[PDB]
């Protein structure tokens, strides 16, 4: 019984992932006993705005005393965490079905609280808060008592008016792919959960910059890989490698249609796109035509790649390249007329190797 | 909604047919924008929902005058396309077929009328044809459209197609009153409306100016090369309807190249010379295109940079005119 | 009239509190703050009941003279904010405002808010009539003073900005004076010690991990790699791409028009003529210097491409294509 | 009598153009596998529900079951006419019906008055309101002996897999000349004037439905003499001129000063200018087929028949390529253009450039 | 009285084909209890998204209980596979005339199971659901109940609001041509049904990746072969046999026209697909062009025209093949533009006749 995303849930300030300067500033103003009166924490959805606003709730409430470090103890901490203070009032505009809405829970704001030093409002995508309540928040922040506190989330910080963000701190919460690799290899160990170090990569750069996806989508590779992560049940729904693309426009330049073909069924076993292989294609020998002109050409990823590029750059004369780029732009513009899109490609192909500058076709 | 004077030759044999039973039930009106087109269709219907004609027209008491007057009547009815969408709905056509089914309120004919029917979709149009086909009886029908070939053949078969333009010198002196401006500009108006004098007059409306902007910028760009320099005359919400005038010198140019005796912009005969001195006649069908093709996009596509576009379509005109260079074809 | 700037204000508001207090700028910040200082003062005498009425081209002569009983009738001190249009008072509002202008006296405190009026504008029955009586404060700093002004507001926050990371707090977040007062105060909670040195603020800028602009400077032939990065790090700030292709595009527009005119007048008075070079000058030159006319023009196509592809299948991951042509404007090009 | 009524076809020997979908419904019939429910597509116009009737009357003859139907018998009769006890007929298309699908499909499991099935013909099944649409697979998995359904959709896709997999669907696809060749037959055995263009024009305006073709070429007897004539065809419709024809000729010979020309006048008697193009574009093919084969020009064409030939035997196949090429572009971005004349001066001008031995360029 | 697309209509999770993925991701839930409250199916139409989520509901009102192998003769089972089930709310957002539209078939949601377990909401496409009665499934999305379960479908996943796919578990259907031609064979194999396989591919080829429209288009085939799968059968339904095509292509190479019009003539006889005549003569020339390469190329049912085809491809030059293929594309170009398909598939031809590499057609 455990589940590693809710295993996880930071308990602490000292172990939430990368997110330092917001961190450092929040657990010294906890140390210090300063704390404005509403915080406004913005990011995609995905990073732990909520996440980082409860450890906050959870440093101003700790019964050990206002604190950067939170024992997870104490009842106050153990419920926080829970989500069932009663104190911590959570509203989240989002929703269409609330019991009793924003306008209601704010009425009560002057109202001390029934436990613990402050009585902590946290309202997710508060962008989200009707008119008739975002009001309400607008005129407790010109007169807010100094037992309550906001710690105010959102997607989307421009849509708030300055009335709200002159009167908040705004904290923005930026993930590195290979951060996330870094916390994916440790959660499955903790689980001893089988792990290939692809797998995690392929994951890592699945969830756009977030643990949140990262370990829902984890939990999802999981069920499909059966008790394992494998890199193929990961690359069953996240493929690249069986991709020839440029072992393609190698073997094109090399001109060895044997393999060229050999390459294309391969391709085609795996129920490719055919149209996006011409496009990775395309924007590869673009961007060998540039590596010509300039050596600063080489990308955030092309590191397992460089070799075989940098080969390609100096080896291959730049007049050859724009007559291969011509022959595969064209190729991909016929191709929805082909009678079959494979047979296009196959054919595009055969249209390099017969107008290939070394090694051409021969005829009796 | 005005009515002109050259509607009358027209209004007559229209009315000359309803008078002595030779009307035809449904009629197709073909017609260039502001011919009047609009008010023929009006003019027509309040004849025959008068219950006490006078002869040629109305009355001005009767119930129909009367409620015709007032607009709102139970025997008129508008078929104008859904608010909000380009086409006409299959629905308001059912709606109003079975809304003549049942007699006529005041006792007499009811008439239909329709905006534009190269405007609706495919299946409002058989949804529609069966109605002609079962004519209830006394009934009366208003098509109406600029282009007739883009309808359906079988549609145009049960209506009955009325050519709606007036001869140059009379649309000439007839616009000479309206607003007072060289003959010369008054005809260069009248040809950049297929002959429409309504919308001629229109184009004066600071349009001229606005007009007479643009071929002092164009004489400067075509013996000087930079075209760019258009961008200010073009660049501006009336960007189609000026690219559209940038054309017509091109398409001028490029007929006088083959020593074709009608122009269109007889407004400024020397920069049409000049221009085909300058462009040879590919070079100019190159521009043209561009010039159409860009337009167009402006028009259709929901919001792409009106500047961008313009100062690519600018810039790229100016690569055409430079020696070497190989131009488009058209394509599919 | 006394005409003053945000600072000069709170100095003002002590000798005495005005008929009428128009706020008139741009700034979401100053006009906020000005507003803040001025009620601050009012509530403090007996001003309890505040009013707000925002004036449209569209608004009926019904509801000033309905407004104008509300506020006629009601027997003590009370406040009005009204509300001037975006695009700022028209031959009828001038009216409007006046008729209103005449329910003043010592018992009711104007304040009118909106961005700067035209000097003709400001000829209006109304504005000249508080211009005996009122006080304007000009809510809109230019590049000499963005700095003074960090220095000023940081000093009051008790921070020692050295000068330079101030330089780099303001080349970061350039005119977006809300950021640059949070990061004063985030850079409070990073060093309680309050000694903001140049090491230790460009640290905290640098790690905080930009403006569209700064991918574009980048982009000015500045070597791609930094774009890239910017412009693969303005994914993760969450912009939409469309609001940064017309930041490419009024910048690169700006560089075709400039680059035509070599020999048309010396860059010097050309940059004065286009009112941007405002630092960006050497930059903007630096980026003249080494594209050609035609690698420019390259550089107008793929942005059109990519204009019409995020605008034609709305949705064809135009991404792919800013990354592409942010490369197309450090490297030279090819007729392919 | 009109030609749209009196040629219903009464077997699927007349029928016209459906061969593989009727040699299944023959053998169907023949050897006595008929299916729960037969499922037609294609657009409006096709036989869907003609082709529907005749498979009807081929069920409930009393001759038997059989792909021939007497059309004599009773049962026949009654069926052509439309109105027959077991051949219930609902259109779904209708917001006045009766008693409701829901209402008809209730008595589904009772006996047939006058036959071995009560058939049910359902046009644009996929228009069905839902609480009924289901009635029918309560049925279909599980439907009785004496029934059968015949469906009519003018898209298949808006019909759930639940039905599109319980039934034998057919699709029904006929060239211009196929509807041109029928036309004639009807007016030859009908003893009515006819004209050779004239069948052209109202076969290709009736956009592959004999169902429509007759109804054309019924006002055509109508509007004109009762006589199938070019004048009359044309006038429901055509230039009814030699102006496709002499356009050509001058755009050949690069005269532009009267391609121009008889833009102009063209234009003047408000023509299609899509029709013109099309016009050029037929006339542009069949001189390469008489330059290919010199019998190719055929029945009504006899009146331009020198003309045609004088161009087949002067101007270079290569080239009339060329010219049909930059036409059929020509109309494709014929709404691409400003206004439908200069897209037609567009292109017409194209032609006369790139055009070997043609206009030149100049300081 | 039976047709294969009823016949074969999946009954278990096993019968279905090739989406292994999604399958067992739906059976790891259906056996662990793992049941989220709203399972969302994308993919284009064809492939079985509907189909796929009854064998879920065949599952979840099951009377042997929740499983993922379900009874095919429970009553529960028999009613959902004949789509009437009580519980089994059956709503198509496509229909413009519903008795009563998904606000009003939504209002009840909150109401109970009369037979099933679960109260399950197959919904065709529901980013064509109107405005007003989406809102009402967001609403009982955010908060559903424990008996209600929602089975959404749709064709383009991106049409629906972010709001909306963040609450459901997403799974993506993708078939290949022989992976249904595989299948055709073996069912026909199964049913003592004859057949050639160059009339399967064609069937294969017919349906695209639409297994449903496979057997439906296989159905058709036997009613008009009369209990045989021939290629003269099914050729006929749709395409020119290999050698009706083949003699076209060689009548074009050797420049004779009259025989070129005289088969397109006795071709318009049997009824044809214009544009497929054009795509067959496209592919043959693709295969001549694939084999003066690699004499290896041809295909196994090509033997009957392997002599024909081997001819031309040791006669023939490349570069010649090359235009016939160009011209015939440009011709396919063409075809919606030209007066008539018909017509315009001449013309194609009497181009390759015009501008023929060997002999052309003459000129005083």
Same mark, same amino acid.
């Given at each position: 019984?455990?589940?590693?995303?809710?295993?996880?849930? *930071?308990?602490?300030?000292?172990?939430?992932?990368?997110?330092?300067?917001?961190?450092?500033?929040?657990?010294?103003?906890?140390?210090?006993?300063?704390?404005?009166?509403?915080?406004?924490?913005?990011?995609?959805?995905?990073?732990?705005?909520?996440?980082?606003?409860?450890?906050?709730?959870?440093?101003?409430?700790?019964?050990?005393?206002?604190?950067?470090? *939170?024992?997870?103890?104490?009842?106050?901490?153990?419920?926080?965490?829970?989500?069932?203070?009663?104190?911590?009032?959570?509203?989240?505009?989002?929703?269409?079905?609330?019991?009793?809405?924003?306008?209601?829970?704010?009425?009560?704001?002057?109202?001390?609280?029934?436990?613990?030093?402050?009585?902590?409002?946290?309202?997710?995508?508060?962008?989200?808060?009707?008119?008739?309540?975002?009001?309400?928040?607008?005129?407790? !922040?010109?007169? $807010?008592?100094?037992?309550?506190?906001?710690?105010?989330?959102?997607?989307?910080?421009?849509?708030?008016?300055?009335?709200?963000?002159?009167?908040? !701190?705004?904290?923005?919460?930026?993930?590195?792919?290979?951060?996330?690799?870094?916390?994916?290899?440790?959660? !499955?160990?903790?689980?001893?959960?089988?792990?290939?170090?692809?797998?995690?990569?392929?994951?890592?750069?699945?969830?756009?910059?977030?643990?949140?996806?990262?370990?829902?989508?984890?939990?999802?590779?999981?069920?499909?890989?059966?008790?394992?992560?494998?890199?193929?049940?990961?690359?069953?729904?996240?493929?690249?490698?069986?991709?020839?693309?440029?072992?393609?426009?190698?073997?094109?330049?090399?001109?060895?249609?044997?393999?060229?073909?050999?390459?294309?069924?391969?391709?085609?076993?795996?129920?490719?796109?055919?149209?996006?292989?011409?496009?990775?294609?395309?924007?590869?020998?673009?961007?060998?035509?540039?590596?010509?002109?300039? $050596?600063?050409?080489?990308?955030?990823?092309?590191?397992?790649?460089?070799?075989?590029?940098?080969?390609?750059?100096?080896?291959? $004369?730049?007049?050859?390249?724009?007559?291969?780029?011509?022959?595969?732009?064209?190729?991909?513009?016929?191709?929805?007329?082909?009678?079959?899109?494979?047979?296009?490609?196959?054919?595009?192909?055969?249209?390099?190797?017969?107008?290939? $500058?070394?090694?051409?076709?021969?005829?009796? | 909604?005005?009515?002109?004077?050259?509607?009358?030759? %027209? &209004?007559?044999?229209?009315?000359?047919?309803?008078?002595?039973?030779?009307?035809?039930?449904?009629?197709?009106?073909?017609?260039?924008?502001?011919?009047?087109?609009?008010?023929?269709?009006?003019?027509?219907?309040?004849?025959?929902?008068?219950?006490?004609?006078?002869?040629?027209?109305?009355?001005?008491?009767?119930?129909?005058?009367?409620?015709?007057?007032?607009?709102?009547?139970?025997?008129?009815?508008?078929?104008?396309?859904?608010?909000?969408?380009?086409?006409?709905?299959? %629905?308001?056509?059912?709606?109003?077929?079975?809304?003549?089914?049942?007699?006529?309120?005041?006792?007499?004919?009811?008439?239909?009328?329709?905006?534009?029917?190269?405007?609706?979709?495919?299946?409002?149009?058989?949804?529609?044809?069966?109605?002609?086909?079962?004519?209830?009886?006394?009934?009366? &029908? &208003?098509?109406?459209?600029?282009?007739?070939?883009?309808?359906?053949?079988?549609?145009?078969?049960?209506?009955?197609?009325?050519?709606?333009?007036?001869?140059?010198?009379?649309?000439?002196?007839?616009?000479?009153?309206?607003?007072?401006?060289?003959? %010369?500009?008054?005809?260069?108006?009248?040809?950049?409306?297929?002959?429409?004098?309504?919308?001629?007059?229109?184009? &004066?409306?600071?349009?001229?100016?606005?007009?007479?902007?643009?071929?002092?910028?164009?004489?400067?760009?075509?013996?000087?090369?930079?075209?760019?320099?258009?961008?200010?005359?073009?660049?501006?919400?009336?960007?189609?309807?000026?690219?559209?005038?940038?054309?017509?010198?091109?398409?001028?140019?490029?007929?006088?190249?083959?020593?074709?005796?009608?122009?269109?912009?007889?407004?400024?005969?020397?920069?049409?010379?000049?221009?085909?001195?300058?462009?040879?006649?590919?070079?100019?069908?190159?521009?043209?295109?561009?010039?159409?093709?860009?337009?167009?996009?402006?028009?259709?596509?929901?919001?792409?940079?009106?500047?961008?576009?313009?100062? %690519?379509?600018?810039?790229?005109?100016?690569?055409?005119?430079?020696?070497?260079?190989?131009?488009?074809?058209?394509?599919? | 009239?006394?005409?003053?700037?945000?600072?000069?204000?709170?100095?003002?508001?002590?000798?005495?509190?005005?008929?009428?207090?128009?706020?008139?700028?741009?700034?979401?910040?100053?006009?906020?703050?000005?507003?803040?200082?001025?009620?601050?003062?009012?509530?403090?005498?007996?001003?309890?009941?505040?009013?707000?009425?925002?004036?449209?081209?569209?608004?009926?002569?019904?509801?000033?003279?309905?407004?104008?009983?509300?506020?006629?009738?009601?027997?003590?001190?009370?406040?009005?904010?009204?509300?001037?249009?975006?695009? +700022?008072?028209?031959?009828?509002?001038?009216?409007?405002?006046?008729?209103?202008?005449?329910?003043?006296?010592?018992?009711?405190?104007?304040?009118?808010?909106?961005?700067?009026?035209?000097?003709?504008?400001?000829?209006?029955?109304?504005?000249?009539?508080?211009?005996?009586?009122?006080?304007?404060?000009?809510?809109?700093?230019?590049?000499?003073?963005?700095?003074?002004?960090?220095?000023?507001?940081?000093?009051?926050?008790?921070?020692?900005?050295?000068?330079?990371?101030?330089?780099?707090?303001?080349?970061?977040?350039?005119?977006?004076?809300?950021?640059?007062?949070?990061?004063?105060?985030?850079?409070?909670?990073?060093?309680?010690?309050?000694?903001?040195?140049?090491?230790?603020?460009?640290?905290?800028?640098?790690?905080?991990?930009?403006?569209?602009?700064?991918?574009?400077?980048?982009?000015?032939? +500045?070597?791609?790699?930094?774009?890239?990065?910017?412009?693969?790090?303005?994914?993760?700030?969450?912009?939409?791409?469309?609001?940064?292709?017309?930041?490419?595009?009024?910048?690169?527009?700006?560089?075709?028009?400039?680059?035509?005119?070599?020999?048309?007048?010396?860059?010097?008075?050309?940059?004065?003529?286009?009112?941007?070079?405002?630092?960006?000058?050497?930059?903007?030159?630096?980026?003249?210097?080494?594209?050609?006319?035609?690698?420019?023009?390259?550089?107008?196509?793929?942005?059109?491409?990519?204009?019409?592809?995020?605008?034609?299948?709305? +949705?064809?991951?135009?991404?792919?294509?800013?990354?592409?042509?942010?490369?197309?404007?450090?490297?030279?090009?090819?007729?392919?």
């Amino acid at each position: 019984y455990q589940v590693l995303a809710r295993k996880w849930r *930071p308990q602490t300030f000292a172990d939430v992932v990368g997110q330092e300067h917001v961190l450092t500033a929040l657990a010294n103003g906890l140390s210090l006993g300063r704390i404005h009166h509403a915080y406004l924490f913005s990011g995609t959805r995905g990073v732990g705005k909520t996440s980082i606003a409860r450890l906050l709730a959870k440093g101003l409430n700790c019964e050990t005393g206002i604190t950067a470090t *939170p024992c997870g103890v104490c009842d106050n901490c153990r419920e926080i965490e829970q989500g069932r203070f009663v104190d911590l009032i959570e509203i989240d505009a989002a929703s269409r079905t609330k019991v009793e809405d924003t306008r209601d829970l704010l009425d009560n704001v002057q109202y001390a609280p029934a436990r613990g030093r402050f009585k902590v409002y946290l309202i997710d995508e508060v962008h989200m808060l009707s008119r008739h309540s975002f009001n309400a928040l607008l005129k407790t !922040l010109e007169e $807010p008592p100094e037992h309550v506190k906001f710690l105010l989330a959102t997607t989307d910080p421009q849509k708030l008016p300055v009335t709200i963000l002159s009167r908040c !701190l705004q904290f923005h919460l930026k993930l590195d792919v290979e951060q996330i690799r870094h916390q994916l290899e440790h959660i !499955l160990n903790e689980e001893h959960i089988a792990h290939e170090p692809r797998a995690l990569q392929l994951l890592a750069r699945a969830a756009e910059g977030s643990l949140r996806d990262a370990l829902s989508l984890t939990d999802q590779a999981i069920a499909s890989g059966d008790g394992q992560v494998s890199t193929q049940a990961v690359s069953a729904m996240l493929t690249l490698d069986d991709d020839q693309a440029l072992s393609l426009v190698e073997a094109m330049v090399e001109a060895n249609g044997e393999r060229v073909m050999a390459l294309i069924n391969e391709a085609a076993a795996r129920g490719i796109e055919w149209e996006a292989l011409l496009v990775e294609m395309l924007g590869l020998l673009h961007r060998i035509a540039m590596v010509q002109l300039s $050596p600063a050409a080489l990308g955030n990823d092309m590191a397992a790649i460089e070799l075989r590029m940098r080969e390609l750059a100096r080896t291959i $004369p730049p007049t050859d390249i724009q007559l291969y780029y011509q022959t595969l732009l064209i190729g991909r513009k016929e191709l929805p007329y082909a009678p079959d899109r494979r047979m296009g490609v196959e054919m595009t192909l055969l249209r390099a190797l017969a107008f290939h $500058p070394r090694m051409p076709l021969p005829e009796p | 909604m005005r009515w002109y004077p050259w509607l009358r030759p %027209d &209004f007559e044999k229209l009315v000359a047919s309803y008078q002595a039973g030779r009307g035809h039930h449904a009629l197709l009106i073909q017609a260039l924008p502001g011919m009047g087109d609009d008010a023929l269709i009006y003019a027509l219907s309040r004849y025959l929902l008068c219950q006490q004609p006078q002869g040629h027209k109305s009355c001005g008491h009767c119930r129909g005058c009367q409620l015709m007057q007032a607009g709102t009547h139970p025997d008129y009815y508008t078929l104008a396309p859904e608010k909000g969408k380009n086409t006409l709905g299959v %629905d308001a056509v059912r709606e109003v077929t079975e809304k003549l089914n049942e007699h006529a309120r005041l006792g007499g004919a009811k008439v239909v009328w329709v905006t534009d029917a190269a405007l609706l979709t495919d299946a409002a149009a058989n949804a529609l044809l069966k109605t002609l086909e079962e004519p209830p009886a006394e009934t009366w &029908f &208003f098509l109406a459209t600029r282009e007739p070939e883009r309808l359906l053949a079988t549609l145009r078969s049960r209506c009955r197609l009325h050519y709606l333009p007036p001869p140059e010198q009379y649309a000439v002196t007839w616009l000479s009153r309206e607003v007072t401006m060289s003959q %010369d500009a008054l005809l260069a108006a009248l040809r950049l409306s297929a002959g429409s004098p309504g919308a001629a007059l229109a184009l &004066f409306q600071d349009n001229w100016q606005a007009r007479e902007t643009l071929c002092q910028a164009l004489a400067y760009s075509v013996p000087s090369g930079d075209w760019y320099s258009l961008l200010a005359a073009l660049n501006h919400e009336q960007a189609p309807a000026r690219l559209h005038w940038l054309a017509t010198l091109l398409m001028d140019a490029l007929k006088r190249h083959h020593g074709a005796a009608q122009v269109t912009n007889v407004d400024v005969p020397g920069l049409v010379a000049e221009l085909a001195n300058h462009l040879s006649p590919s070079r100019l069908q190159a521009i043209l295109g561009d010039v159409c093709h860009i337009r167009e996009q402006l028009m259709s596509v929901t919001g792409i940079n009106r500047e961008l576009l313009i100062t %690519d379509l600018l810039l790229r005109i100016e690569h055409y005119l430079q020696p070497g260079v190989v131009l488009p074809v058209p394509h599919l | 009239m006394i005409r003053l700037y945000p600072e000069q204000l709170r100095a003002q508001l002590n000798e005495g509190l005005r008929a009428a207090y128009l706020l008139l700028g741009n700034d979401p910040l100053l006009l906020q703050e000005s507003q803040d200082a001025v009620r601050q003062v009012a509530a403090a005498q007996g001003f309890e009941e505040h009013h707000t009425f925002s004036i449209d081209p569209n608004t009926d002569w019904n509801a000033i003279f309905s407004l104008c009983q509300a506020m006629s009738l009601f027997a003590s001190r009370q406040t009005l904010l009204l509300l001037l249009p975006e695009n +700022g008072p028209n031959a009828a509002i001038n009216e409007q405002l006046l008729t209103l202008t005449g329910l003043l006296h010592d018992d009711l405190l104007l304040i009118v808010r909106g961005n700067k009026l035209s000097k003709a504008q400001e000829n209006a029955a109304w504005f000249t009539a508080l211009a005996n009586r009122s006080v304007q404060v000009t809510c809109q700093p230019e590049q000499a003073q963005l700095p003074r002004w960090v220095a000023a507001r940081a000093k009051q926050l008790n921070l020692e900005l050295d000068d330079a990371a101030n330089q780099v707090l303001c080349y970061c977040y350039e005119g977006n004076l809300l950021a640059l007062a949070q990061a004063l105060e985030r850079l409070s909670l990073l060093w309680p010690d309050g000694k903001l040195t140049l090491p230790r603020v460009e640290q905290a800028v640098n790690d905080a991990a930009f403006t569209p602009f700064h991918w574009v400077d980048a982009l000015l032939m +500045g070597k791609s790699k930094r774009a890239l990065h910017i412009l693969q790090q303005l994914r993760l700030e969450g912009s939409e791409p469309v609001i940064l292709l017309r930041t490419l595009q009024r910048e690169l527009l700006l560089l075709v028009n400039l680059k035509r005119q070599s020999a048309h007048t010396p860059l010097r008075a050309l940059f004065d003529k286009h009112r941007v070079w405002q630092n960006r000058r050497g930059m903007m030159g630096e980026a003249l210097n080494r594209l050609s006319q035609t690698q420019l023009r390259q550089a107008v196509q793929l942005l059109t491409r990519t204009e019409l592809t995020l605008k034609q299948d709305y +949705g064809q991951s135009v991404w792919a294509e800013l990354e592409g042509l942010s490369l197309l404007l450090c490297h030279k090009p090819l007729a392919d």
